[PDB]
Scaffold this active site. Sequence first.
Site, short mmCIF file in Angstrom:
data_model
loop_
_atom_site.label_atom_id
_atom_site.label_comp_id
_atom_site.label_asym_id
_atom_site.label_seq_id
_atom_site.Cartn_x
_atom_site.Cartn_y
_atom_site.Cartn_z
N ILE A 195 -32.63 -6.20 -85.54
CA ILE A 195 -33.84 -7.00 -85.33
C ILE A 195 -33.90 -7.69 -83.96
O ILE A 195 -34.92 -8.29 -83.61
CB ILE A 195 -34.02 -8.04 -86.45
CG1 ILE A 195 -32.74 -8.84 -86.68
CG2 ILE A 195 -34.43 -7.36 -87.75
CD1 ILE A 195 -32.92 -10.05 -87.57
N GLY A 196 -32.81 -7.61 -83.20
CA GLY A 196 -32.74 -8.24 -81.89
C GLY A 196 -31.47 -7.87 -81.14
O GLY A 196 -30.41 -7.67 -81.73
N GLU A 197 -31.59 -7.77 -79.82
CA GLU A 197 -30.45 -7.61 -78.92
C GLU A 197 -30.22 -8.95 -78.25
O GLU A 197 -31.09 -9.82 -78.29
CB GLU A 197 -30.73 -6.52 -77.88
CG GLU A 197 -31.79 -6.87 -76.85
CD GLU A 197 -32.43 -5.64 -76.23
OE1 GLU A 197 -31.73 -4.63 -76.05
OE2 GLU A 197 -33.64 -5.70 -75.91
N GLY A 229 -24.42 -9.91 -77.70
CA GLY A 229 -24.40 -8.86 -78.70
C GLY A 229 -25.71 -8.63 -79.45
O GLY A 229 -26.76 -9.17 -79.08
N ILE A 230 -25.62 -7.84 -80.51
CA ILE A 230 -26.76 -7.49 -81.35
C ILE A 230 -26.90 -8.47 -82.52
O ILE A 230 -25.92 -9.06 -82.97
CB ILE A 230 -26.58 -6.06 -81.91
CG1 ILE A 230 -26.52 -5.04 -80.77
CG2 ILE A 230 -27.70 -5.70 -82.88
CD1 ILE A 230 -25.88 -3.72 -81.15
N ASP A 262 -28.42 -23.55 -72.63
CA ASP A 262 -29.27 -22.37 -72.71
C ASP A 262 -30.53 -22.62 -73.55
O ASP A 262 -30.92 -21.80 -74.37
CB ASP A 262 -28.49 -21.16 -73.27
CG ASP A 262 -29.09 -19.81 -72.85
OD1 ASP A 262 -30.05 -19.75 -72.05
OD2 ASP A 262 -28.57 -18.79 -73.32
C1 B49 Z 1 -42.53 -6.66 -84.60
C2 B49 Z 1 -41.27 -7.50 -84.51
N1 B49 Z 1 -41.59 -8.94 -84.31
C3 B49 Z 1 -42.08 -9.33 -82.96
C4 B49 Z 1 -41.62 -8.45 -81.81
C5 B49 Z 1 -40.49 -9.81 -84.78
C6 B49 Z 1 -39.18 -9.57 -84.01
N2 B49 Z 1 -38.15 -10.52 -84.38
C7 B49 Z 1 -37.54 -10.50 -85.56
O1 B49 Z 1 -37.85 -9.70 -86.43
C8 B49 Z 1 -36.43 -11.46 -85.85
C9 B49 Z 1 -36.20 -12.12 -87.16
C10 B49 Z 1 -37.03 -11.93 -88.40
N3 B49 Z 1 -35.10 -12.91 -87.05
C11 B49 Z 1 -34.60 -12.81 -85.80
C12 B49 Z 1 -33.40 -13.56 -85.36
C13 B49 Z 1 -32.54 -14.41 -86.22
C14 B49 Z 1 -32.54 -14.80 -87.64
O2 B49 Z 1 -33.41 -14.41 -88.48
N4 B49 Z 1 -31.53 -15.63 -87.97
C15 B49 Z 1 -30.79 -15.85 -86.85
C16 B49 Z 1 -29.65 -16.61 -86.61
C17 B49 Z 1 -29.09 -16.66 -85.32
C18 B49 Z 1 -29.64 -15.95 -84.25
F1 B49 Z 1 -29.06 -16.04 -83.05
C19 B49 Z 1 -30.79 -15.17 -84.42
C20 B49 Z 1 -31.36 -15.11 -85.68
C21 B49 Z 1 -35.38 -11.91 -84.91
C22 B49 Z 1 -35.10 -11.58 -83.46
#
Ligand code: B49
Length: 287
Positions: free
Chosen positions: A29-31, A35-36, A142
């Site tokens: 869900i994220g880079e 890390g990932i 940060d």
């Molecule tokens: C189409 C996709 N959307 C817009 C581009 C949403 C993208 N983004 C997403 O899905 C997304 C979701 C639903 N959660 C996170 C990140 C975290 C989370 O849930 N707990 C954490 C705890 C620590 C941390 F360091 C990150 C997270 C992202 C990037």
Amino acid sequence: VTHEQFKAALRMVVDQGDPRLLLDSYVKIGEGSTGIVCLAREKHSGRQVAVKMMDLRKQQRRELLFNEVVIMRDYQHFNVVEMYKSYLVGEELWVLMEFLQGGALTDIVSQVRLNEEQIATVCEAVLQALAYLHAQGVIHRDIKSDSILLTLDGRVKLSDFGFCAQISKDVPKRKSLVGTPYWMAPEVISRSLYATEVDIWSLGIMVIEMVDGEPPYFSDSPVQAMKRLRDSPPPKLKNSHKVSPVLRDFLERMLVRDPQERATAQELLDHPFLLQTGLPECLVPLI
Ligand SMILES: CCN(CC)CCNC(=O)c1c(C)[nH]c(/C=C2\C(=O)Nc3ccc(F)cc32)c1C
């Protein structure tokens, strides 16, 4: 120090064991810088988790991986991301944290323009987290919209603790070049002795993100932007004409070159701008 010695030191801080067989539904869900982050699900409970996965071998400064565990271990707060567990998994550190369905503020800001009520709600939550951390001697270093996550109901949570510094009686200030270029305080860029004040400058740049959609000098290379931040008066809102005088005042108290005159987090919490906060519900339409 060898990789194996570092891994052994890091092991002292994580929970023991291999978490693999306790989780399923691994989805990215994220880079990130270190890390990932993957969505995953626990088997025994069915609970969703965010799993940050970081390679011990490929880090700018691998000692900062300790921060990925220790800050959340030490510090809990209503507006700070909750960590469940951490593990060493092969040559990776895995940190298991609450799933925040709203995602990161960065992806809202690039997509939808926040109104001042929403900006105030975001700032109040971040300032509560910062007032708390600063009182414990933690400098985040940060602060930027990427560090800010939203729950489904619009609760704002601070994340991304990798760059943290924990000050102490013996080392009350830091001097090291740590942060993300466009958001770094001039005193960090100049490698001056600094403390928690640097987070208030960075918060000011995040306010500019929320108003303008980008930090100052974003069209410059990172080094050039840093030279401009080091050498110039505080940066101005492109959209200064769109914002209320009270928001303008709130921002001007954060983007102050003199770090001692710069407002503290606690001082900003008492600022009239934050009387404009909405219920966390006011952010739900962004999600
Ligand atoms: C189409 C996709 N959307 C817009 C581009 C949403 C993208 N983004 C997403 O899905 C997304 C979701 C639903 N959660 C996170 C990140 C975290 C989370 O849930 N707990 C954490 C705890 C620590 C941390 F360091 C990150 C997270 C992202 C990037």
